[PDB]
């Protein structure tokens, strides 16, 4: 599924990301935008055999178990397939664990390169929440 900008913002607000661990909602919509372009089925195989899954491109090397990545750690104790659902529950639950680490949202490369330092709140403006 491909969420609309406002559709995702409202959904993420429902999943409690409006101000999770110091990150305003705009951050999460922006990140999803440049990470997967709002596509929940998006996947990307990396140079280390790990794969990024979901609307938030969660990596199989540290976060989820896809069963085919070398030193998989599965910190989110969840199978990567759960992060490919049209239902964002798993992706959010896992992303909250990721951001609870000291690296914060820097865990997301696209977010760091396209959102950190920009007017992220712009991503929720003009939306019925």
């Amino acid at each position, epitope marked *: 599924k491909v969420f609309g900008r406002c559709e995702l913002a409202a959904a993420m*607000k*429902r*999943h*409690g*990301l*409006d*101000n*999770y*661990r*110091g990150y305003s909602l705009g951050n999460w919509v922006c990140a999803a935008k440049f990470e997967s372009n709002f596509n929940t089925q998006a996947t990307n195989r990396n140079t280390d055999g790990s794969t990024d899954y979901g609307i938030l491109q969660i990596n199989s090397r*540290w976060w989820c178990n896809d069963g085919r990545t070398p030193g998989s*750690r*599965n*910190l989110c*104790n969840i199978p990567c397939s759960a992060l490919l659902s049209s239902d964002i*529950t798993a992706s959010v*639950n896992c992303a*909250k*664990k990721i951001v*609870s*680490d*000291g*690296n914060g949202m820097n865990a997301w490369v696209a977010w760091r390169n396209r959102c950190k330092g920009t007017d992220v709140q712009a991503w929720i403006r003009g939306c019925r929440l």
Partner: antibody
Amino acid sequence: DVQLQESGPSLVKPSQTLSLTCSVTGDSITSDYWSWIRKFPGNRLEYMGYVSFSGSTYYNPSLKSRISITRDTSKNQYYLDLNSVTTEDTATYYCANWDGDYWGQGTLVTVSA
Amino acid sequence: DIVLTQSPATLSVTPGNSVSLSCRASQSIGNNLHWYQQKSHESPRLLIKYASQSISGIPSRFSGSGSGTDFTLSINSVETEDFGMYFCQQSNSWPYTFGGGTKLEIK
């Protein structure tokens, strides 16, 4: 599967450093976030802090920076150090994973002269 | 620090009856409110996570609801195994905090 267990002294003296060890079995310490939670005599719970996979830590301001949480990979166990304790630190200590599904048995530590 | 308040502090019920336990936060925390149960001489057990998500291994009679600052934990048809303490905890902001707890005992 995963199991946690706290070990350490039950009785400590005021002003000394209270230390507890949490033994993890069933998986590597390096594969999760680990925490410490204590229960005060009045049925009051306080989240002390946790250490994430990158080694970064988060401590409860209430502890006024007397706390330290470290990991020992080889021994597959993590610890809690609490400096200059007072009778106010008397409580039942628990170690648990960040997710909250795995908890130790909890261990009472009494601070007394 | 976010402050979680649980009321009532004590609740007496007859097995077979249903109860609802309240937990309010001093400010909004979205869905970042979790429920724990704790029996004497025992460690806390996660019942509900993120306001309403179920936990594998926990009886189905337990359910949570709420968002923002108002939350409730529900026990459809209380059982003897359910008497003990119930605590809510927020993870929206650091430091994580617990509510004062509600005690559930036989009427």
